[PDB]
Amino acid sequence: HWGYGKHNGPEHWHKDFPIAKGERQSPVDIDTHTAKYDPSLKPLSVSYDQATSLRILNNGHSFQVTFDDSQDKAVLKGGPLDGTYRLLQFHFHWGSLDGQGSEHTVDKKKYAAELHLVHWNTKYGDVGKAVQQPDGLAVLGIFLKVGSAKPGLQKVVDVLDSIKTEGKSADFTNFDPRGLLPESLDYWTYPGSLTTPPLAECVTWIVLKEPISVSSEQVLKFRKLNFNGEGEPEELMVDNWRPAQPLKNRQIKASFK
Ligand SMILES: CC(C)NC[C@H](O)COc1ccc(S(N)(=O)=O)cc1
Ligand SMILES: CC(C)NC[C@H](O)COc1ccc(S(N)(=O)=O)cc1
Ligand SMILES: [Zn+2]
């Protein structure tokens, strides 16, 4: 099926997911001089104090940490959003080299990686219903640059050896995702899509201006994961990012001057 290689990557996806060429696809380049400050945008409310992590999983395209979303334990509100969005999972996209790996870009600049915290609108009852709605999901995107280590990331990095190949999972309870955020919650926002198939146009994107720093040793451990399942020819999980898509009839708004 679909992937990130030459024969199944982003340029092929439209043949099975024709919405790949749609009117509100993600990611996009964020042109900082064209984004407009919107004084009506409220501060984001990230309420992760009661988060309950469950498992960490290599899904063949990234690794993800999943959460109990059966109650309002870890929620995102405010910002551009109406109502309450529950945290379902987080995952990353990264490169083979430090100069590439992010999905969104800022004035064409690519970061080494990008963290996505995926939330769904509780008014739709479950995530499967939410992905069929134009305001069903909210993804909080955070850029990673290489510099000093991120201490809140280390517990993730230390377990990646146990989920090297596609399909492997491990217990990952008591993880606090608040340790993955930067200091500032200043953000850009625009309406978009999932960045992997099915590419559904159901996402309010919230992309933080301030990157987090991670160490070279931390990102190197991302790059030792495998796209393949156990026993298959080893293909390193690197460059699992979709490039920027046409902005079309959309305006990116900034929460800050
Ligand atoms: C070489 C064999 C094992 N791979 C199976 C077959 O080629 C699949 O080829 C493809 C290639 C692209 C896609 S899409 N439009 O989802 O990105 C789906 C199947
Ligand atoms: C039944 C539905 C919810 N399953 C959806 C599927 O797992 C894909 O989910 C996702 C979720 C988030 C993203 S991203 N890179 O835009 O944050 C991509 C795919
Ligand atoms: Zn993602």
PDB file of C-alpha atoms and ligand atoms in Angstrom:
ATOM      1  CA  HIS A   1       0.000   0.000   0.000  1.00  0.00           C
ATOM      2  CA  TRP A   2       0.960   3.640   0.479  1.00  0.00           C
ATOM      3  CA  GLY A   3       4.197   4.805   2.042  1.00  0.00           C
ATOM      4  CA  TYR A   4       7.077   7.222   1.570  1.00  0.00           C
ATOM      5  CA  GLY A   5       9.229   5.410  -1.010  1.00  0.00           C
ATOM      6  CA  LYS A   6       9.746   6.291  -4.660  1.00  0.00           C
ATOM      7  CA  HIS A   7       7.055   3.816  -5.727  1.00  0.00           C
ATOM      8  CA  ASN A   8       4.411   4.395  -3.035  1.00  0.00           C
ATOM      9  CA  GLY A   9       5.117   7.923  -1.758  1.00  0.00           C
ATOM     10  CA  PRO A  10       3.273  11.260  -1.760  1.00  0.00           C
ATOM     11  CA  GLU A  11       3.226  11.589  -5.566  1.00  0.00           C
ATOM     12  CA  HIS A  12       1.320   8.281  -5.844  1.00  0.00           C
ATOM     13  CA  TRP A  13      -1.283   8.819  -3.104  1.00  0.00           C
ATOM     14  CA  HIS A  14      -3.858  10.579  -5.304  1.00  0.00           C
ATOM     15  CA  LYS A  15      -4.507   7.376  -7.285  1.00  0.00           C
ATOM     16  CA  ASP A  16      -6.137   5.727  -4.252  1.00  0.00           C
ATOM     17  CA  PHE A  17      -7.041   8.902  -2.301  1.00  0.00           C
ATOM     18  CA  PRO A  18      -8.168  11.501  -4.884  1.00  0.00           C
ATOM     19  CA  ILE A  19      -8.631  14.127  -2.194  1.00  0.00           C
ATOM     20  CA  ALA A  20      -4.863  14.392  -2.206  1.00  0.00           C
ATOM     21  CA  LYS A  21      -5.468  17.091  -4.846  1.00  0.00           C
ATOM     22  CA  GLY A  22      -8.275  18.757  -2.870  1.00  0.00           C
ATOM     23  CA  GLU A  23      -8.952  22.325  -1.785  1.00  0.00           C
ATOM     24  CA  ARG A  24      -7.687  22.174   1.830  1.00  0.00           C
ATOM     25  CA  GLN A  25      -4.698  19.792   1.907  1.00  0.00           C
ATOM     26  CA  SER A  26      -1.857  19.755   4.482  1.00  0.00           C
ATOM     27  CA  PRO A  27       0.908  20.483   5.191  1.00  0.00           C
ATOM     28  CA  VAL A  28       1.578  23.970   3.777  1.00  0.00           C
ATOM     29  CA  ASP A  29       4.381  26.494   3.780  1.00  0.00           C
ATOM     30  CA  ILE A  30       3.751  29.207   6.383  1.00  0.00           C
ATOM     31  CA  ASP A  31       4.762  32.518   4.796  1.00  0.00           C
ATOM     32  CA  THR A  32       5.275  34.646   7.900  1.00  0.00           C
ATOM     33  CA  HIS A  33       4.986  37.948   6.031  1.00  0.00           C
ATOM     34  CA  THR A  34       1.595  36.950   4.534  1.00  0.00           C
ATOM     35  CA  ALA A  35       0.047  35.437   7.681  1.00  0.00           C
ATOM     36  CA  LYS A  36      -2.262  37.986   9.316  1.00  0.00           C
ATOM     37  CA  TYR A  37      -2.447  38.686  13.033  1.00  0.00           C
ATOM     38  CA  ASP A  38      -6.027  38.032  14.186  1.00  0.00           C
ATOM     39  CA  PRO A  39      -6.785  39.840  17.474  1.00  0.00           C
ATOM     40  CA  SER A  40     -10.034  37.871  17.848  1.00  0.00           C
ATOM     41  CA  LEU A  41      -8.069  34.622  18.329  1.00  0.00           C
ATOM     42  CA  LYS A  42      -8.111  33.531  21.965  1.00  0.00           C
ATOM     43  CA  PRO A  43      -5.206  31.931  23.829  1.00  0.00           C
ATOM     44  CA  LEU A  44      -4.899  28.197  23.453  1.00  0.00           C
ATOM     45  CA  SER A  45      -5.929  26.101  26.444  1.00  0.00           C
ATOM     46  CA  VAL A  46      -3.835  22.917  26.689  1.00  0.00           C
ATOM     47  CA  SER A  47      -5.139  20.884  29.658  1.00  0.00           C
ATOM     48  CA  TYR A  48      -3.014  17.715  29.841  1.00  0.00           C
ATOM     49  CA  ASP A  49      -2.803  17.387  33.652  1.00  0.00           C
ATOM     50  CA  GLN A  50      -4.988  14.244  33.725  1.00  0.00           C
ATOM     51  CA  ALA A  51      -3.591  12.587  30.573  1.00  0.00           C
ATOM     52  CA  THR A  52      -3.561   8.765  30.573  1.00  0.00           C
ATOM     53  CA  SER A  53      -1.100   7.282  28.086  1.00  0.00           C
ATOM     54  CA  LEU A  54      -1.611   3.626  27.128  1.00  0.00           C
ATOM     55  CA  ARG A  55       0.724   2.173  24.467  1.00  0.00           C
ATOM     56  CA  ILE A  56       3.554   3.071  22.113  1.00  0.00           C
ATOM     57  CA  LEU A  57       3.361   1.523  18.650  1.00  0.00           C
ATOM     58  CA  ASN A  58       5.340   1.299  15.390  1.00  0.00           C
ATOM     59  CA  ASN A  59       2.571   1.541  12.773  1.00  0.00           C
ATOM     60  CA  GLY A  60       4.835   1.208   9.708  1.00  0.00           C
ATOM     61  CA  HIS A  61       4.714   4.948   8.916  1.00  0.00           C
ATOM     62  CA  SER A  62       5.670   6.547  12.262  1.00  0.00           C
ATOM     63  CA  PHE A  63       5.624   5.643  15.934  1.00  0.00           C
ATOM     64  CA  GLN A  64       2.691   6.792  18.029  1.00  0.00           C
ATOM     65  CA  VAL A  65       1.749   7.058  21.696  1.00  0.00           C
ATOM     66  CA  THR A  66      -1.952   6.454  22.355  1.00  0.00           C
ATOM     67  CA  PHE A  67      -4.146   7.861  25.137  1.00  0.00           C
ATOM     68  CA  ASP A  68      -7.403   7.019  26.897  1.00  0.00           C
ATOM     69  CA  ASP A  69      -9.882   9.391  25.221  1.00  0.00           C
ATOM     70  CA  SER A  70     -13.046   7.946  26.780  1.00  0.00           C
ATOM     71  CA  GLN A  71     -13.368  11.005  29.075  1.00  0.00           C
ATOM     72  CA  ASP A  72     -12.178  14.635  29.072  1.00  0.00           C
ATOM     73  CA  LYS A  73      -8.780  13.828  30.598  1.00  0.00           C
ATOM     74  CA  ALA A  74      -6.379  15.583  28.194  1.00  0.00           C
ATOM     75  CA  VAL A  75      -8.125  18.247  26.122  1.00  0.00           C
ATOM     76  CA  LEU A  76      -7.362  21.186  23.840  1.00  0.00           C
ATOM     77  CA  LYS A  77      -9.728  24.185  23.824  1.00  0.00           C
ATOM     78  CA  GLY A  78      -9.647  27.863  22.974  1.00  0.00           C
ATOM     79  CA  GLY A  79      -7.535  29.273  20.190  1.00  0.00           C
ATOM     80  CA  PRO A  80      -9.539  29.000  16.959  1.00  0.00           C
ATOM     81  CA  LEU A  81     -11.617  26.078  18.289  1.00  0.00           C
ATOM     82  CA  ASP A  82     -15.290  25.694  19.217  1.00  0.00           C
ATOM     83  CA  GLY A  83     -15.813  23.164  21.961  1.00  0.00           C
ATOM     84  CA  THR A  84     -13.609  20.480  23.445  1.00  0.00           C
ATOM     85  CA  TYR A  85     -11.061  18.315  21.629  1.00  0.00           C
ATOM     86  CA  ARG A  86      -9.711  15.161  23.303  1.00  0.00           C
ATOM     87  CA  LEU A  87      -6.126  13.965  22.849  1.00  0.00           C
ATOM     88  CA  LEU A  88      -6.058  10.608  21.014  1.00  0.00           C
ATOM     89  CA  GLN A  89      -2.387  10.094  20.105  1.00  0.00           C
ATOM     90  CA  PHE A  90       0.873  11.816  19.276  1.00  0.00           C
ATOM     91  CA  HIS A  91       3.460  10.865  16.650  1.00  0.00           C
ATOM     92  CA  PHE A  92       6.371  12.397  14.727  1.00  0.00           C
ATOM     93  CA  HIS A  93       7.665  12.966  11.192  1.00  0.00           C
ATOM     94  CA  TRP A  94      11.441  13.229  10.674  1.00  0.00           C
ATOM     95  CA  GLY A  95      14.264  13.277   8.142  1.00  0.00           C
ATOM     96  CA  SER A  96      17.392  11.374   7.175  1.00  0.00           C
ATOM     97  CA  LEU A  97      19.373  14.617   7.778  1.00  0.00           C
ATOM     98  CA  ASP A  98      18.886  17.564  10.137  1.00  0.00           C
ATOM     99  CA  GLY A  99      17.867  19.948   7.312  1.00  0.00           C
ATOM    100  CA  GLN A 100      14.666  18.070   6.451  1.00  0.00           C
ATOM    101  CA  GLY A 101      11.910  16.149   8.192  1.00  0.00           C
ATOM    102  CA  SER A 102       9.148  18.600   9.061  1.00  0.00           C
ATOM    103  CA  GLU A 103       5.883  18.657   7.117  1.00  0.00           C
ATOM    104  CA  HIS A 104       4.990  22.299   7.579  1.00  0.00           C
ATOM    105  CA  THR A 105       7.691  24.778   6.600  1.00  0.00           C
ATOM    106  CA  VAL A 106       8.244  28.385   7.729  1.00  0.00           C
ATOM    107  CA  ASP A 107       9.303  30.753   4.939  1.00  0.00           C
ATOM    108  CA  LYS A 108      10.394  27.538   3.131  1.00  0.00           C
ATOM    109  CA  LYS A 109      12.612  26.483   6.073  1.00  0.00           C
ATOM    110  CA  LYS A 110      12.406  22.773   6.942  1.00  0.00           C
ATOM    111  CA  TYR A 111      12.994  21.598  10.510  1.00  0.00           C
ATOM    112  CA  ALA A 112      14.563  18.273  11.531  1.00  0.00           C
ATOM    113  CA  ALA A 113      11.222  16.834  12.680  1.00  0.00           C
ATOM    114  CA  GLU A 114       7.635  17.687  13.568  1.00  0.00           C
ATOM    115  CA  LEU A 115       5.475  16.486  16.472  1.00  0.00           C
ATOM    116  CA  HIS A 116       1.716  16.076  15.946  1.00  0.00           C
ATOM    117  CA  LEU A 117      -0.660  15.901  18.934  1.00  0.00           C
ATOM    118  CA  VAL A 118      -3.945  14.647  17.459  1.00  0.00           C
ATOM    119  CA  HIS A 119      -7.293  15.644  19.043  1.00  0.00           C
ATOM    120  CA  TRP A 120     -10.959  15.061  18.113  1.00  0.00           C
ATOM    121  CA  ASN A 121     -14.097  17.138  18.692  1.00  0.00           C
ATOM    122  CA  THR A 122     -16.191  15.519  21.441  1.00  0.00           C
ATOM    123  CA  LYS A 123     -19.458  16.673  19.867  1.00  0.00           C
ATOM    124  CA  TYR A 124     -19.002  13.919  17.252  1.00  0.00           C
ATOM    125  CA  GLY A 125     -18.820  11.136  19.862  1.00  0.00           C
ATOM    126  CA  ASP A 126     -15.932   9.113  18.404  1.00  0.00           C
ATOM    127  CA  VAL A 127     -12.922   9.771  16.190  1.00  0.00           C
ATOM    128  CA  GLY A 128     -14.336   7.776  13.264  1.00  0.00           C
ATOM    129  CA  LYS A 129     -17.285  10.160  13.085  1.00  0.00           C
ATOM    130  CA  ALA A 130     -15.052  13.195  13.639  1.00  0.00           C
ATOM    131  CA  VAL A 131     -12.866  12.470  10.591  1.00  0.00           C
ATOM    132  CA  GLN A 132     -15.966  12.841   8.401  1.00  0.00           C
ATOM    133  CA  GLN A 133     -16.530  16.459   9.578  1.00  0.00           C
ATOM    134  CA  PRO A 134     -14.815  19.703   8.480  1.00  0.00           C
ATOM    135  CA  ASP A 135     -14.173  20.619  12.145  1.00  0.00           C
ATOM    136  CA  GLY A 136     -13.704  17.078  13.444  1.00  0.00           C
ATOM    137  CA  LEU A 137     -10.021  17.131  14.447  1.00  0.00           C
ATOM    138  CA  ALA A 138      -7.461  19.603  15.788  1.00  0.00           C
ATOM    139  CA  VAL A 139      -3.763  18.811  15.377  1.00  0.00           C
ATOM    140  CA  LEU A 140      -1.211  20.715  17.442  1.00  0.00           C
ATOM    141  CA  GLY A 141       2.047  20.798  15.462  1.00  0.00           C
ATOM    142  CA  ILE A 142       5.424  21.483  17.073  1.00  0.00           C
ATOM    143  CA  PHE A 143       8.735  21.836  15.190  1.00  0.00           C
ATOM    144  CA  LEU A 144      11.912  20.083  16.371  1.00  0.00           C
ATOM    145  CA  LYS A 145      15.401  21.517  15.846  1.00  0.00           C
ATOM    146  CA  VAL A 146      18.681  19.845  16.804  1.00  0.00           C
ATOM    147  CA  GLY A 147      20.485  21.413  19.760  1.00  0.00           C
ATOM    148  CA  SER A 148      20.172  20.634  23.460  1.00  0.00           C
ATOM    149  CA  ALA A 149      18.291  17.534  24.583  1.00  0.00           C
ATOM    150  CA  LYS A 150      14.588  17.641  25.452  1.00  0.00           C
ATOM    151  CA  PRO A 151      14.304  15.881  28.836  1.00  0.00           C
ATOM    152  CA  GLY A 152      10.582  15.207  28.414  1.00  0.00           C
ATOM    153  CA  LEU A 153      11.333  13.269  25.211  1.00  0.00           C
ATOM    154  CA  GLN A 154      13.890  10.885  26.726  1.00  0.00           C
ATOM    155  CA  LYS A 155      11.413   8.298  28.021  1.00  0.00           C
ATOM    156  CA  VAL A 156      10.080   7.944  24.464  1.00  0.00           C
ATOM    157  CA  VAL A 157      13.556   7.604  22.958  1.00  0.00           C
ATOM    158  CA  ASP A 158      14.583   4.958  25.475  1.00  0.00           C
ATOM    159  CA  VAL A 159      11.755   2.564  24.506  1.00  0.00           C
ATOM    160  CA  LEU A 160      12.130   2.772  20.690  1.00  0.00           C
ATOM    161  CA  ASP A 161      14.454  -0.270  20.707  1.00  0.00           C
ATOM    162  CA  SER A 162      11.476  -2.389  21.769  1.00  0.00           C
ATOM    163  CA  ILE A 163       9.294  -1.310  18.801  1.00  0.00           C
ATOM    164  CA  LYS A 164      11.845  -1.417  15.987  1.00  0.00           C
ATOM    165  CA  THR A 165       9.637  -2.973  13.298  1.00  0.00           C
ATOM    166  CA  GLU A 166       6.124  -2.464  11.965  1.00  0.00           C
ATOM    167  CA  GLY A 167       3.399  -3.875  14.216  1.00  0.00           C
ATOM    168  CA  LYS A 168       5.396  -3.932  17.462  1.00  0.00           C
ATOM    169  CA  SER A 169       3.927  -2.232  20.542  1.00  0.00           C
ATOM    170  CA  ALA A 170       4.815  -1.767  24.212  1.00  0.00           C
ATOM    171  CA  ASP A 171       3.227  -0.535  27.423  1.00  0.00           C
ATOM    172  CA  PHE A 172       3.718   3.214  27.739  1.00  0.00           C
ATOM    173  CA  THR A 173       1.722   4.289  30.783  1.00  0.00           C
ATOM    174  CA  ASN A 174       2.274   7.356  32.975  1.00  0.00           C
ATOM    175  CA  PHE A 175       3.802   9.492  30.218  1.00  0.00           C
ATOM    176  CA  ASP A 176       3.221  13.249  30.616  1.00  0.00           C
ATOM    177  CA  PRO A 177       2.986  14.931  27.172  1.00  0.00           C
ATOM    178  CA  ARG A 178       3.348  18.377  28.779  1.00  0.00           C
ATOM    179  CA  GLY A 179       7.116  17.724  28.705  1.00  0.00           C
ATOM    180  CA  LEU A 180       7.076  17.964  24.888  1.00  0.00           C
ATOM    181  CA  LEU A 181       5.846  21.584  24.639  1.00  0.00           C
ATOM    182  CA  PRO A 182       7.914  24.755  24.159  1.00  0.00           C
ATOM    183  CA  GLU A 183       7.569  27.713  26.534  1.00  0.00           C
ATOM    184  CA  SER A 184       5.366  29.864  24.281  1.00  0.00           C
ATOM    185  CA  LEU A 185       1.933  28.933  22.936  1.00  0.00           C
ATOM    186  CA  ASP A 186       1.991  31.535  20.134  1.00  0.00           C
ATOM    187  CA  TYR A 187       0.651  29.830  17.009  1.00  0.00           C
ATOM    188  CA  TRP A 188      -0.455  29.972  13.389  1.00  0.00           C
ATOM    189  CA  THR A 189      -3.770  28.379  12.367  1.00  0.00           C
ATOM    190  CA  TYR A 190      -5.462  27.346   9.116  1.00  0.00           C
ATOM    191  CA  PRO A 191      -8.004  24.745   7.918  1.00  0.00           C
ATOM    192  CA  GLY A 192      -6.416  21.617   6.464  1.00  0.00           C
ATOM    193  CA  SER A 193      -6.253  17.839   6.282  1.00  0.00           C
ATOM    194  CA  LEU A 194      -4.635  14.693   7.581  1.00  0.00           C
ATOM    195  CA  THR A 195      -1.132  14.508   6.097  1.00  0.00           C
ATOM    196  CA  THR A 196      -1.317  10.735   5.477  1.00  0.00           C
ATOM    197  CA  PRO A 197      -4.040   8.706   3.742  1.00  0.00           C
ATOM    198  CA  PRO A 198      -7.001   8.981   3.866  1.00  0.00           C
ATOM    199  CA  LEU A 199      -5.999  12.701   3.687  1.00  0.00           C
ATOM    200  CA  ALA A 200      -9.430  13.658   5.045  1.00  0.00           C
ATOM    201  CA  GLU A 201     -10.171  17.395   5.089  1.00  0.00           C
ATOM    202  CA  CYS A 202     -11.198  17.442   8.737  1.00  0.00           C
ATOM    203  CA  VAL A 203      -8.359  19.245  10.596  1.00  0.00           C
ATOM    204  CA  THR A 204      -8.025  22.640  12.225  1.00  0.00           C
ATOM    205  CA  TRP A 205      -4.233  23.018  12.211  1.00  0.00           C
ATOM    206  CA  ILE A 206      -2.540  24.817  15.123  1.00  0.00           C
ATOM    207  CA  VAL A 207       1.218  25.156  14.529  1.00  0.00           C
ATOM    208  CA  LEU A 208       3.374  26.586  17.320  1.00  0.00           C
ATOM    209  CA  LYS A 209       5.829  29.343  16.415  1.00  0.00           C
ATOM    210  CA  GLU A 210       8.525  28.262  18.913  1.00  0.00           C
ATOM    211  CA  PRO A 211      10.337  24.990  18.104  1.00  0.00           C
ATOM    212  CA  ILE A 212      11.562  22.597  20.738  1.00  0.00           C
ATOM    213  CA  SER A 213      15.220  21.561  20.801  1.00  0.00           C
ATOM    214  CA  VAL A 214      16.197  17.874  20.820  1.00  0.00           C
ATOM    215  CA  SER A 215      19.686  16.410  20.864  1.00  0.00           C
ATOM    216  CA  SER A 216      21.443  14.693  17.977  1.00  0.00           C
ATOM    217  CA  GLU A 217      21.385  11.473  20.034  1.00  0.00           C
ATOM    218  CA  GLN A 218      17.592  11.722  20.426  1.00  0.00           C
ATOM    219  CA  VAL A 219      16.880  12.226  16.711  1.00  0.00           C
ATOM    220  CA  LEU A 220      19.406   9.528  15.755  1.00  0.00           C
ATOM    221  CA  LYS A 221      17.295   7.061  17.724  1.00  0.00           C
ATOM    222  CA  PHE A 222      14.232   7.990  15.623  1.00  0.00           C
ATOM    223  CA  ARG A 223      16.256   7.123  12.506  1.00  0.00           C
ATOM    224  CA  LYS A 224      17.020   3.578  13.713  1.00  0.00           C
ATOM    225  CA  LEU A 225      13.357   2.518  13.492  1.00  0.00           C
ATOM    226  CA  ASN A 226      12.232   0.382  10.542  1.00  0.00           C
ATOM    227  CA  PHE A 227       9.394   0.828   8.057  1.00  0.00           C
ATOM    228  CA  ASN A 228       9.410  -2.943   7.493  1.00  0.00           C
ATOM    229  CA  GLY A 229       8.053  -5.710   9.666  1.00  0.00           C
ATOM    230  CA  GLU A 230      10.244  -8.224  11.454  1.00  0.00           C
ATOM    231  CA  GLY A 231      12.102 -10.517   9.055  1.00  0.00           C
ATOM    232  CA  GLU A 232      11.801  -8.307   5.955  1.00  0.00           C
ATOM    233  CA  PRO A 233      14.630  -6.414   4.214  1.00  0.00           C
ATOM    234  CA  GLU A 234      15.583  -3.583   6.549  1.00  0.00           C
ATOM    235  CA  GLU A 235      14.498  -0.148   5.333  1.00  0.00           C
ATOM    236  CA  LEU A 236      15.174   2.604   7.860  1.00  0.00           C
ATOM    237  CA  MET A 237      12.176   4.726   8.900  1.00  0.00           C
ATOM    238  CA  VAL A 238      13.425   8.142   7.737  1.00  0.00           C
ATOM    239  CA  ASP A 239      11.885  10.886   5.586  1.00  0.00           C
ATOM    240  CA  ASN A 240       8.302  10.002   6.596  1.00  0.00           C
ATOM    241  CA  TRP A 241       7.029  13.492   5.739  1.00  0.00           C
ATOM    242  CA  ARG A 242       4.632  14.821   3.101  1.00  0.00           C
ATOM    243  CA  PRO A 243       5.869  17.998   1.344  1.00  0.00           C
ATOM    244  CA  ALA A 244       4.018  21.306   1.378  1.00  0.00           C
ATOM    245  CA  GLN A 245       0.789  21.419  -0.645  1.00  0.00           C
ATOM    246  CA  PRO A 246      -0.899  24.330  -2.488  1.00  0.00           C
ATOM    247  CA  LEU A 247      -2.463  26.879  -0.130  1.00  0.00           C
ATOM    248  CA  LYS A 248      -5.315  27.571  -2.618  1.00  0.00           C
ATOM    249  CA  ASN A 249      -8.198  29.650  -1.167  1.00  0.00           C
ATOM    250  CA  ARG A 250      -6.943  29.788   2.429  1.00  0.00           C
ATOM    251  CA  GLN A 251      -5.519  32.391   4.801  1.00  0.00           C
ATOM    252  CA  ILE A 252      -3.125  31.526   7.617  1.00  0.00           C
ATOM    253  CA  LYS A 253      -3.843  33.494  10.795  1.00  0.00           C
ATOM    254  CA  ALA A 254      -1.348  34.338  13.551  1.00  0.00           C
ATOM    255  CA  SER A 255      -2.184  34.590  17.263  1.00  0.00           C
ATOM    256  CA  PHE A 256       0.697  37.030  17.821  1.00  0.00           C
ATOM    257  CA  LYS A 257       2.132  40.256  16.425  1.00  0.00           C
TER     258      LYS A 257
HETATM  259  C1  LIG B   1       5.858  -4.434  -4.717  1.00  0.00           C
HETATM  260  C2  LIG B   1       4.580  -4.861  -4.009  1.00  0.00           C
HETATM  261  C3  LIG B   1       4.858  -5.776  -2.825  1.00  0.00           C
HETATM  262  N1  LIG B   1       3.871  -3.688  -3.531  1.00  0.00           N
HETATM  263  C4  LIG B   1       2.438  -3.838  -3.770  1.00  0.00           C
HETATM  264  C5  LIG B   1       1.996  -2.940  -4.926  1.00  0.00           C
HETATM  265  O1  LIG B   1       3.091  -2.604  -5.717  1.00  0.00           O
HETATM  266  C6  LIG B   1       1.380  -1.663  -4.350  1.00  0.00           C
HETATM  267  O2  LIG B   1       1.656  -0.584  -5.218  1.00  0.00           O
HETATM  268  C7  LIG B   1       1.044   0.610  -4.778  1.00  0.00           C
HETATM  269  C8  LIG B   1       1.621   1.842  -5.046  1.00  0.00           C
HETATM  270  C9  LIG B   1       1.006   2.999  -4.594  1.00  0.00           C
HETATM  271  C10 LIG B   1      -0.178   2.915  -3.880  1.00  0.00           C
HETATM  272  S1  LIG B   1      -0.997   4.429  -3.271  1.00  0.00           S
HETATM  273  N2  LIG B   1      -1.929   5.159  -4.508  1.00  0.00           N
HETATM  274  O3  LIG B   1      -1.854   4.101  -2.126  1.00  0.00           O
HETATM  275  O4  LIG B   1       0.015   5.382  -2.780  1.00  0.00           O
HETATM  276  C11 LIG B   1      -0.756   1.680  -3.604  1.00  0.00           C
HETATM  277  C12 LIG B   1      -0.140   0.529  -4.058  1.00  0.00           C
HETATM  278  C1  LIG B   2     -10.535   5.760  11.701  1.00  0.00           C
HETATM  279  C2  LIG B   2      -9.595   6.955  11.651  1.00  0.00           C
HETATM  280  C3  LIG B   2      -9.698   7.813  12.905  1.00  0.00           C
HETATM  281  N1  LIG B   2      -8.227   6.495  11.488  1.00  0.00           N
HETATM  282  C4  LIG B   2      -7.379   7.574  10.983  1.00  0.00           C
HETATM  283  C5  LIG B   2      -6.001   7.012  10.632  1.00  0.00           C
HETATM  284  O1  LIG B   2      -5.503   6.322  11.735  1.00  0.00           O
HETATM  285  C6  LIG B   2      -5.039   8.158  10.289  1.00  0.00           C
HETATM  286  O2  LIG B   2      -5.061   9.046  11.385  1.00  0.00           O
HETATM  287  C7  LIG B   2      -4.235  10.184  11.261  1.00  0.00           C
HETATM  288  C8  LIG B   2      -4.186  11.091  12.306  1.00  0.00           C
HETATM  289  C9  LIG B   2      -3.391  12.214  12.195  1.00  0.00           C
HETATM  290  C10 LIG B   2      -2.630  12.413  11.042  1.00  0.00           C
HETATM  291  S1  LIG B   2      -1.577  13.886  10.898  1.00  0.00           S
HETATM  292  N2  LIG B   2      -0.089  13.426  10.282  1.00  0.00           N
HETATM  293  O3  LIG B   2      -2.233  14.798   9.977  1.00  0.00           O
HETATM  294  O4  LIG B   2      -1.464  14.460  12.242  1.00  0.00           O
HETATM  295  C11 LIG B   2      -2.681  11.508   9.993  1.00  0.00           C
HETATM  296  C12 LIG B   2      -3.489  10.385  10.106  1.00  0.00           C
HETATM  297 ZN    ZN B   3       1.402  13.676  11.518  1.00  0.00          ZN
END
